[PDB]
Amino acid sequence: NQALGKKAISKMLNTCYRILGLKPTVIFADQIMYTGFAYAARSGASVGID
Amino acid sequence: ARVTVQDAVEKIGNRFDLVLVAARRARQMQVGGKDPLVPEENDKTTVIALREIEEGLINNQILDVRERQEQQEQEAAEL
Amino acid sequence: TEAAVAGKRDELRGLKENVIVGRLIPAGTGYAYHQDRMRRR
Amino acid sequence: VDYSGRSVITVGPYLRLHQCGLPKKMALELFKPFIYGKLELRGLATTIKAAKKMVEREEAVVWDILDEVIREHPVLLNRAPTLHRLGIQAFEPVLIEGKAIQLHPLVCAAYNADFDGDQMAVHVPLTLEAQLEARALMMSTNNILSPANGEPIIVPSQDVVLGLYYMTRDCVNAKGEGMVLTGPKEAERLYRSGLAS
Amino acid sequence: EIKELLKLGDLPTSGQIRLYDGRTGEQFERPVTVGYMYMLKLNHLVDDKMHARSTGSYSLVTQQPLGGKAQFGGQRFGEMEVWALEAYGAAYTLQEMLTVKSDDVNGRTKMYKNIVDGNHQMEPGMPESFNVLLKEIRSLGINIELED
Amino acid sequence: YQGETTQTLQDYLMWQVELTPFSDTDRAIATSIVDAVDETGYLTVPLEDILESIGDEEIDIDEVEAVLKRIQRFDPVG
Amino acid sequence: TANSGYLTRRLVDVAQDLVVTEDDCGTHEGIMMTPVIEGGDVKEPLRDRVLGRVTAEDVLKPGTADILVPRNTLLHEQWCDLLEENSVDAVKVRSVVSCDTDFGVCAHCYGRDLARGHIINKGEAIGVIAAQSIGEPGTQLTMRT
Amino acid sequence: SVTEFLKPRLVDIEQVSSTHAKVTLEPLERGFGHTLGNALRRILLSSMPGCAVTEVEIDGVLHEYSTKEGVQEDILEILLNLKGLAVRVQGKDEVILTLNKSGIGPVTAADITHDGDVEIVKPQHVICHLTDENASISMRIKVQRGRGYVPASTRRLLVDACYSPVERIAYNVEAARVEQRTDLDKLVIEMETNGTIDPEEAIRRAATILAEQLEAFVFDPILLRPVDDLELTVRSANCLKAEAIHYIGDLVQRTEVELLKTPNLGKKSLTEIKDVLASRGLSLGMRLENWPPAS
Amino acid sequence: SVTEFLKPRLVDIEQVSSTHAKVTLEPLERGFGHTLGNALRRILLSSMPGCAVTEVEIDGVLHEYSTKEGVQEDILEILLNLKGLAVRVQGKDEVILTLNKSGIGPVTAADITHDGDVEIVKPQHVICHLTDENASISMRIKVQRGRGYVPASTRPIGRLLVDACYSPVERIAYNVEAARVEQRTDLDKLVIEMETNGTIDPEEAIRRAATILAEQLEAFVDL
Amino acid sequence: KPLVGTGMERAVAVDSGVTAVAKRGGVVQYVDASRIVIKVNEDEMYPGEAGIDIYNLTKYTRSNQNTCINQMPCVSLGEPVERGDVLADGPSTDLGELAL
Ligand SMILES: [Mg+2]
Ligand SMILES: [Zn+2]
């Protein structure tokens, strides 16, 4: 429930590892990668001169 | 297949003894005449051995006891 | 030269000596193997 | 050493971090004695030279044999220089078409590898103890913490965090705001349907 | 002046147009930068990089696999990769890369025969490049020998 | 300079002898049979010289012929 | 690029054959872990200098006789949270240098694995791991400057 | 040959056994996975006929947010609980129900007055929690037939109308291979419904709608031969027949020591068997995975 | 009612040029314009049948890395020019055309010997140039029907192979806009603008796309 | 062609002798995929000389890097030429301009 930068994502995986275990952490990492890729592509971000 | 071996490590207790126990059981299943204690699902001998270790069916003491029993029965049968 | 003039002897106890010869290093899964050798020696 | 190859690495975003992408023309060479044994085990070849010829001319059944023999058999991927022990990791092969190895993104930080011309070397564990050491010790899903300090080494890096940052943000007067939803499923159903931002 | 050229031919001044997704057919949420860039094809082809080996020709004095792609050689497993296997604790994976897969002459054939036979087990033996070291050390007038 | 190991005809024949399901005595007989093969592929000694080179009293010429008929269908055939 | 390689080669060669060969050497001497203070700022808190080690003495509380933790404990995350709740002062811990085991180290002087959360196992080669850990970041340090 | 395409063959729909299903179809032509999946998902999300609650009218409440005595949930909480109420009307296209109730137990969907046309799929669905004994709740709930999602902001207390029987659908396209062709498609559709219809029926109805929208344009041979092929002598053939070896594949797997123990079979007779088997490039120590090929 | 959808029909077809057309489909419900437009665009861009040049055989050449006396282009450039030849055959799945030319000048697609079934849609397609007074070119071109893109590598010492791109269409663009049908105002209208090479009818292309979509969709109706 | 350049393409293309630059001005009298024959002007000819320049193009030769070297004409039959302008392109050259 916040804007997830790069430090707010690593702490999420660390919390998952410390609370749950190893298998949920692996599945969570794969799902995080998939969702991040999908919505980064869907956002249509770019870079211009303006 | 499988992705993690954490349960087998917890049951055996050490990550270096698990490899040896699993190798012993997998060699028993592969080059010997043994058959898996769990339903094999298109799996190889190493993964079957790991799945047997995960359920408390295989460890060093069980293997030693079964080997001694097999040797005693074979020596009795040969007479 | 200094190991020859002194007649030294190597017991193959480390990790780099079992790699030159091609044995199991006494660190990982080869620790119990070397424990057996030291026990039966 | 024998049973070893190398080639250029590309990216596969569809993988799971316990598997890699191996060309099917490299795995045919790396796994050749296994293919001979599997061929003459099931009666396809009654001699070693018959299996040798079948593999040489690349019939249509040697690919099924290869898919059977590479099922659960880790391969060690290594990239030089090997500065720490995370530079060699064991993955499960997936037979792909092409000449480039496909590497999972999340494992790029450990290798210090980027896809602008890097190359990797693949090694095949042979014995029954090497296949279990590559699965219980060197597997990619086993080392997710750094042995130097104890912090995770599988952190998302650049455009995995950009998408999660863009998705988890707020705007003052975005479309369809202020409504009361009944769960995440309704939120996704509104987003896909275009009724909300 | 780029923005004057982008107005001479009727194009957006910003240099960014809106794009649609080819698979779903829905517009990307933000404008993206499209244009024409001059691309080169460098002389690093993946056809000249891919290599593989299972068994081939070995050297004479030290019977190890040759090096290179034109000689159907093997990949070098150097010192820094031995350190990484010593740090994991992989003793068998390290032992099979020093004797069976590289140098032990009588173990290579046994391993190949066992792999073809469906039995994955090795008889380690002794590397053939340590006997060369012993013969070269004791040709200097120094009596080095294995005992017991 | 070190060199390179080339594969001759006898090395190729041995590579197949070791991969053939022989027995301990059959492989010993096959070693003698493959040893007495010149560069043209023809056996250069009579089978009575191979039966003598084995150095065993219980082996008969029938076993030597049986092993020879199997070696004769290696690669190359003949 | 080359100086770091030479340094890590020397580090590996000096400590190649150090292996955890025991479980307890029977001595409880050790070092005292105090936070680093250059004079104006606390560079590193004490929660990172003791996380995953074994105490060498009775470290309970400065006040009186209130045993918060026993003589030999593995200070994991929960124990460190308890440490920060009560504002725990300097602690004495067992270090590798002050170990009574000959030809190796024991699993209690060393501490945590730092790759798995548990305590270090017998056999694991710690000298190579430490040499690679020190020598790997050597390419991020300035050479000429 | 130019107008024929691959068709799915391995459809293996898997049930989570109540309202959640995962259907896998393979192999599609390259690129048809995205086409079919996106079309089906868009049709299921946007246009699927159904019946849903449109608006409510509580006697004691005249505002979207207010205070109602004796109810634990807020007014918008009651609206949320009514939004998820799944109804299956048969005859009409607009009906009205009443929820007069009093007591201390929770007020659930089973407390609605019965109608012949109206059917409730989850009587266990809880609408509100009444706490005070003297408290009572009586409201009128109207349901109507429509398609898709209609927010209240597009247009008594208004409720967002979810006519479509779908709650979530997601498709995923993976790589599949036919024996020769390298790049094909494998479509995996995972979907859930609100209980009024099964997932497979919703998929069938979406496919029917889309297809009706287009009506204006549409071993080795040697091992199999009988052991009689060999030029065996009388005694060796009789011993093999007595050993029930009717094929070369059976004889080949028999190891030498096992055949030595065979009665009436000698060393010189075993050597003849080995000779006649070797004259065909065969030995006596071969292994076969599963020999008898149902023949 | 609510379970009754108005179904579209091919209303208008506008031939803007020989290789450009705009077809119209209306009336459409809400959300069906984008449902049909992208599906038809993908099917048109991926699954259309056509005819392509596959093999060439020039009289006096051995390989495509050579030159001819009197011809300004290399054989490789002649093959690359023959790749773009747009041809419509109407009776078979394979035909052989013949080209004989002599004298100074261009050798266009109008110099191919006339055949009853074969139709050349762009007779101004320049293949090569003859720059010599006594120079002749004689070639036998093989044309066959297929779909997709088949390189020569995947599939005599004088027969030259060329990669075959069988797809007629070049680009597709669809637009959804409001339509005026009866009294309802929620109905839409889909306009599909397509650029082919001139060797396929727009209406039959739309009908082929719809037939492919329906026959692929029939696997879900039973399930 | 780059379509966005700096103007140094022509100098690099001409100075490196991969093209075919006319030695004397004239009129192209023969154009072929492997040779060009130029009829030199009357005011650039030596006494007692048949004025023609013959350029033999390099076709599919192998370079030191196992690549291809191939020159293609860029002139037409019967068109004027002057001294110093290109007659045939080279590897990575488009009308006398560098194109990589
Ligand atoms: Mg790089
Ligand atoms: Zn100690």
Coordinates of N, CA and C in Angstrom, one line a residue, chain I residues 63-181:
Chain I
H63 N 26.0 -19.8 -60.8 CA 25.5 -19.4 -59.4 C 25.1 -18.0 -59.4
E64 N 24.6 -17.5 -58.3 CA 24.1 -16.1 -58.2 C 25.2 -15.2 -57.8
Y65 N 26.4 -15.6 -57.6 CA 27.5 -14.7 -57.3 C 28.4 -14.4 -58.5
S66 N 27.7 -14.4 -59.7 CA 28.4 -14.1 -60.9 C 27.7 -13.0 -61.6
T67 N 28.2 -12.7 -62.9 CA 27.7 -11.6 -63.7 C 27.5 -12.1 -65.1
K68 N 26.7 -11.4 -65.9 CA 26.4 -11.7 -67.3 C 26.9 -10.6 -68.2
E69 N 27.4 -11.0 -69.4 CA 27.9 -10.1 -70.3 C 26.8 -9.3 -71.0
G70 N 26.8 -8.0 -70.8 CA 25.8 -7.1 -71.4 C 24.7 -6.7 -70.4
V71 N 24.6 -7.3 -69.2 CA 23.6 -7.0 -68.2 C 24.2 -6.2 -67.1
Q72 N 23.6 -5.1 -66.8 CA 24.2 -4.1 -65.8 C 24.1 -4.6 -64.4
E73 N 23.0 -5.4 -64.1 CA 22.9 -5.9 -62.7 C 23.6 -7.3 -62.5
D74 N 23.9 -7.6 -61.3 CA 24.4 -8.9 -60.9 C 23.2 -9.8 -60.9
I75 N 23.5 -11.1 -60.9 CA 22.5 -12.1 -60.8 C 21.8 -12.1 -59.4
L76 N 22.5 -11.7 -58.4 CA 21.9 -11.6 -57.1 C 20.8 -10.4 -57.1
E77 N 21.2 -9.3 -57.7 CA 20.2 -8.2 -57.8 C 19.0 -8.6 -58.7
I78 N 19.3 -9.4 -59.7 CA 18.2 -9.8 -60.6 C 17.2 -10.7 -59.8
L79 N 17.8 -11.6 -58.9 CA 16.9 -12.4 -58.0 C 16.2 -11.6 -57.1
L80 N 16.8 -10.5 -56.5 CA 16.1 -9.7 -55.5 C 15.0 -8.9 -56.2
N81 N 15.2 -8.6 -57.5 CA 14.1 -7.9 -58.3 C 13.0 -8.9 -58.6
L82 N 13.3 -10.2 -58.9 CA 12.3 -11.2 -59.1 C 11.5 -11.6 -57.9
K83 N 12.1 -11.3 -56.7 CA 11.3 -11.6 -55.5 C 10.0 -10.7 -55.4
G84 N 10.1 -9.5 -55.9 CA 9.0 -8.6 -55.8 C 8.0 -8.7 -56.9
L85 N 8.1 -9.7 -57.8 CA 7.2 -9.8 -58.9 C 5.8 -10.3 -58.3
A86 N 4.8 -9.5 -58.7 CA 3.4 -9.8 -58.2 C 2.7 -10.5 -59.3
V87 N 2.3 -11.8 -59.1 CA 1.7 -12.6 -60.2 C 0.5 -13.3 -59.6
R88 N -0.6 -13.4 -60.3 CA -1.8 -14.1 -59.9 C -2.1 -15.3 -60.9
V89 N -1.9 -16.5 -60.4 CA -2.3 -17.7 -61.2 C -3.7 -18.1 -60.7
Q90 N -4.4 -18.7 -61.7 CA -5.8 -18.9 -61.5 C -6.3 -20.4 -61.7
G91 N -5.4 -21.3 -62.1 CA -5.9 -22.6 -62.4 C -5.1 -23.7 -61.7
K92 N -3.9 -23.4 -61.3 CA -3.0 -24.4 -60.7 C -2.3 -23.9 -59.4
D93 N -1.5 -24.8 -58.8 CA -0.7 -24.4 -57.7 C 0.8 -24.2 -58.0
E94 N 1.1 -24.3 -59.3 CA 2.5 -24.2 -59.8 C 2.5 -24.0 -61.3
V95 N 3.3 -23.0 -61.7 CA 3.4 -22.6 -63.1 C 4.9 -22.2 -63.4
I96 N 5.3 -22.3 -64.7 CA 6.6 -21.9 -65.1 C 6.4 -20.9 -66.2
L97 N 6.9 -19.7 -66.0 CA 6.9 -18.6 -67.0 C 8.3 -18.5 -67.7
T98 N 8.3 -17.9 -68.9 CA 9.5 -17.8 -69.7 C 9.7 -16.4 -70.1
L99 N 10.9 -15.9 -70.0 CA 11.3 -14.6 -70.3 C 12.4 -14.6 -71.3
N100 N 12.2 -14.1 -72.5 CA 13.3 -13.9 -73.5 C 13.3 -12.5 -74.0
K101 N 14.5 -11.9 -74.0 CA 14.6 -10.5 -74.3 C 16.0 -10.2 -75.0
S102 N 16.0 -9.3 -76.0 CA 17.2 -8.9 -76.7 C 17.1 -7.5 -77.1
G103 N 18.3 -6.8 -77.0 CA 18.4 -5.4 -77.4 C 18.6 -4.5 -76.2
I104 N 19.1 -3.3 -76.4 CA 19.3 -2.3 -75.4 C 18.0 -1.9 -74.8
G105 N 17.9 -1.9 -73.5 CA 16.8 -1.4 -72.8 C 16.4 -2.1 -71.5
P106 N 15.4 -1.6 -70.8 CA 14.9 -2.3 -69.6 C 14.2 -3.6 -70.0
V107 N 14.2 -4.6 -69.0 CA 13.5 -5.8 -69.2 C 12.4 -5.9 -68.1
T108 N 11.2 -5.4 -68.5 CA 10.1 -5.3 -67.5 C 9.3 -6.6 -67.4
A109 N 8.3 -6.6 -66.6 CA 7.4 -7.7 -66.4 C 6.5 -7.9 -67.6
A110 N 6.4 -7.0 -68.5 CA 5.6 -7.1 -69.7 C 6.3 -8.0 -70.8
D111 N 7.5 -8.3 -70.6 CA 8.3 -9.1 -71.5 C 8.2 -10.6 -71.3
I112 N 7.5 -11.0 -70.2 CA 7.2 -12.4 -70.0 C 6.2 -13.0 -71.0
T113 N 6.5 -14.2 -71.5 CA 5.6 -14.8 -72.5 C 4.2 -14.9 -71.9
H114 N 3.2 -14.5 -72.7 CA 1.8 -14.5 -72.3 C 1.3 -15.9 -72.0
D115 N 0.6 -16.1 -70.9 CA 0.0 -17.4 -70.5 C -1.4 -17.2 -70.2
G116 N -2.3 -18.2 -70.4 CA -3.7 -18.0 -70.2 C -4.1 -17.9 -68.7
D117 N -3.4 -18.7 -67.9 CA -3.8 -18.6 -66.4 C -3.1 -17.5 -65.7
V118 N -1.8 -17.3 -66.0 CA -1.0 -16.3 -65.3 C -1.4 -14.9 -65.6
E119 N -1.5 -14.1 -64.6 CA -1.8 -12.7 -64.8 C -0.7 -11.8 -64.1
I120 N -0.1 -10.9 -64.8 CA 0.9 -10.0 -64.2 C 0.1 -8.7 -63.9
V121 N 0.2 -8.3 -62.7 CA -0.6 -7.2 -62.2 C 0.1 -5.8 -62.3
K122 N 1.4 -5.9 -62.4 CA 2.3 -4.6 -62.5 C 3.2 -4.9 -63.7
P123 N 2.8 -4.6 -64.9 CA 3.7 -4.8 -66.1 C 4.9 -3.9 -66.2
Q124 N 5.0 -2.9 -65.3 CA 6.1 -2.0 -65.3 C 7.2 -2.3 -64.4
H125 N 7.2 -3.5 -63.8 CA 8.2 -3.9 -62.8 C 9.5 -4.2 -63.5
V126 N 10.5 -3.4 -63.3 CA 11.8 -3.5 -64.0 C 12.6 -4.7 -63.3
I127 N 13.1 -5.6 -64.1 CA 13.9 -6.7 -63.6 C 15.4 -6.5 -63.8
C128 N 15.8 -6.1 -65.0 CA 17.2 -5.8 -65.3 C 17.3 -4.8 -66.5
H129 N 18.5 -4.5 -66.9 CA 18.8 -3.6 -68.0 C 19.8 -4.3 -68.9
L130 N 19.5 -4.3 -70.2 CA 20.5 -4.7 -71.2 C 21.2 -3.5 -71.8
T131 N 22.5 -3.5 -71.7 CA 23.3 -2.3 -72.1 C 24.2 -2.6 -73.3
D132 N 23.9 -3.7 -74.1 CA 24.7 -4.1 -75.2 C 23.8 -4.3 -76.4
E133 N 24.4 -4.1 -77.6 CA 23.6 -4.2 -78.8 C 23.3 -5.6 -79.2
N134 N 24.2 -6.5 -79.0 CA 24.0 -7.9 -79.2 C 24.1 -8.6 -77.8
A135 N 22.9 -8.5 -77.1 CA 22.8 -9.1 -75.8 C 21.4 -9.7 -75.6
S136 N 21.3 -10.9 -75.1 CA 20.0 -11.5 -74.8 C 20.0 -12.2 -73.5
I137 N 18.8 -12.2 -72.9 CA 18.6 -12.9 -71.6 C 17.4 -13.8 -71.8
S138 N 17.6 -15.0 -71.3 CA 16.5 -16.1 -71.4 C 16.5 -16.8 -70.0
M139 N 15.3 -16.8 -69.4 CA 15.2 -17.3 -68.1 C 13.8 -18.0 -67.9
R140 N 13.8 -19.0 -67.1 CA 12.6 -19.8 -66.7 C 12.3 -19.6 -65.3
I141 N 11.1 -19.0 -65.0 CA 10.8 -18.6 -63.6 C 9.7 -19.5 -63.1
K142 N 9.9 -20.0 -61.9 CA 8.9 -20.9 -61.3 C 8.1 -20.2 -60.2
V143 N 6.8 -20.3 -60.4 CA 5.9 -19.6 -59.5 C 5.0 -20.6 -58.8
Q144 N 4.8 -20.6 -57.5 CA 3.9 -21.5 -56.9 C 3.2 -20.9 -55.7
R145 N 2.1 -21.5 -55.3 CA 1.2 -20.9 -54.3 C 1.5 -21.5 -52.9
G146 N 1.4 -20.6 -51.9 CA 1.5 -21.0 -50.5 C 1.1 -19.9 -49.6
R147 N 1.6 -20.0 -48.4 CA 1.3 -18.9 -47.4 C 2.4 -18.8 -46.4
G148 N 2.7 -17.6 -46.0 CA 3.8 -17.4 -45.0 C 5.1 -16.9 -45.6
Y149 N 6.2 -17.3 -45.0 CA 7.6 -17.0 -45.4 C 8.4 -18.2 -45.3
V150 N 8.8 -18.7 -46.5 CA 9.7 -19.9 -46.6 C 11.0 -19.5 -47.1
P151 N 12.1 -19.5 -46.3 CA 13.4 -19.3 -46.9 C 13.9 -20.5 -47.6
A152 N 14.9 -20.2 -48.5 CA 15.4 -21.3 -49.4 C 16.2 -22.3 -48.5
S153 N 16.9 -21.8 -47.5 CA 17.7 -22.6 -46.7 C 17.0 -23.8 -46.0
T154 N 15.8 -23.4 -45.4 CA 15.0 -24.4 -44.7 C 14.5 -25.5 -45.6
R155 N 13.9 -25.1 -46.7 CA 13.3 -26.1 -47.7 C 14.4 -26.8 -48.4
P156 N 20.9 -29.7 -59.9 CA 21.7 -29.1 -61.0 C 22.5 -28.0 -60.5
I157 N 23.5 -27.5 -61.3 CA 24.4 -26.5 -60.9 C 24.0 -25.2 -61.6
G158 N 22.8 -25.0 -62.1 CA 22.4 -23.8 -62.8 C 21.1 -23.3 -62.3
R159 N 20.5 -24.0 -61.3 CA 19.2 -23.6 -60.8 C 19.3 -22.8 -59.5
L160 N 18.7 -21.7 -59.4 CA 18.9 -20.7 -58.3 C 17.7 -20.6 -57.5
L161 N 17.8 -20.7 -56.2 CA 16.7 -20.7 -55.2 C 16.6 -19.3 -54.7
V162 N 15.3 -18.9 -54.5 CA 15.0 -17.6 -53.9 C 14.0 -17.8 -52.8
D163 N 14.1 -17.0 -51.7 CA 13.2 -17.1 -50.6 C 11.8 -16.6 -51.0
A164 N 10.7 -17.3 -50.5 CA 9.4 -17.1 -51.0 C 8.5 -16.5 -49.9
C165 N 8.1 -15.3 -50.1 CA 7.1 -14.6 -49.2 C 5.8 -14.6 -49.9
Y166 N 4.9 -15.4 -49.4 CA 3.6 -15.7 -50.1 C 2.5 -14.7 -49.7
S167 N 2.7 -13.9 -48.7 CA 1.6 -13.1 -48.2 C 1.3 -11.9 -49.1
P168 N 0.1 -11.7 -49.6 CA -0.2 -10.6 -50.4 C -0.2 -9.2 -49.7
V169 N -0.9 -9.2 -48.5 CA -1.1 -8.0 -47.8 C 0.1 -7.3 -47.3
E170 N 0.2 -6.0 -47.3 CA 1.3 -5.2 -46.8 C 1.0 -4.5 -45.5
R171 N -0.1 -3.8 -45.3 CA -0.5 -3.3 -44.1 C -2.0 -3.2 -43.9
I172 N -2.4 -3.3 -42.7 CA -3.8 -3.3 -42.3 C -4.0 -2.2 -41.2
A173 N -5.1 -1.4 -41.3 CA -5.4 -0.5 -40.3 C -6.9 -0.4 -40.2
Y174 N -7.4 -0.6 -38.9 CA -8.9 -0.6 -38.7 C -9.2 0.6 -37.8
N175 N -10.5 1.1 -38.0 CA -11.0 2.3 -37.3 C -12.4 2.1 -37.0
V176 N -12.8 2.3 -35.7 CA -14.1 2.1 -35.2 C -14.7 3.5 -35.0
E177 N -15.9 3.7 -35.6 CA -16.6 5.0 -35.5 C -18.1 4.8 -35.4
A178 N -18.7 5.9 -34.8 CA -20.2 5.8 -34.6 C -20.9 5.7 -35.9
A179 N -22.0 4.9 -35.8 CA -22.8 4.7 -37.0 C -24.3 5.1 -36.7
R180 N -25.0 5.5 -37.8 CA -26.4 6.0 -37.7 C -27.3 4.9 -38.3
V181 N -27.7 4.0 -37.4 CA -28.6 2.9 -37.7 C -29.9 3.0 -37.0

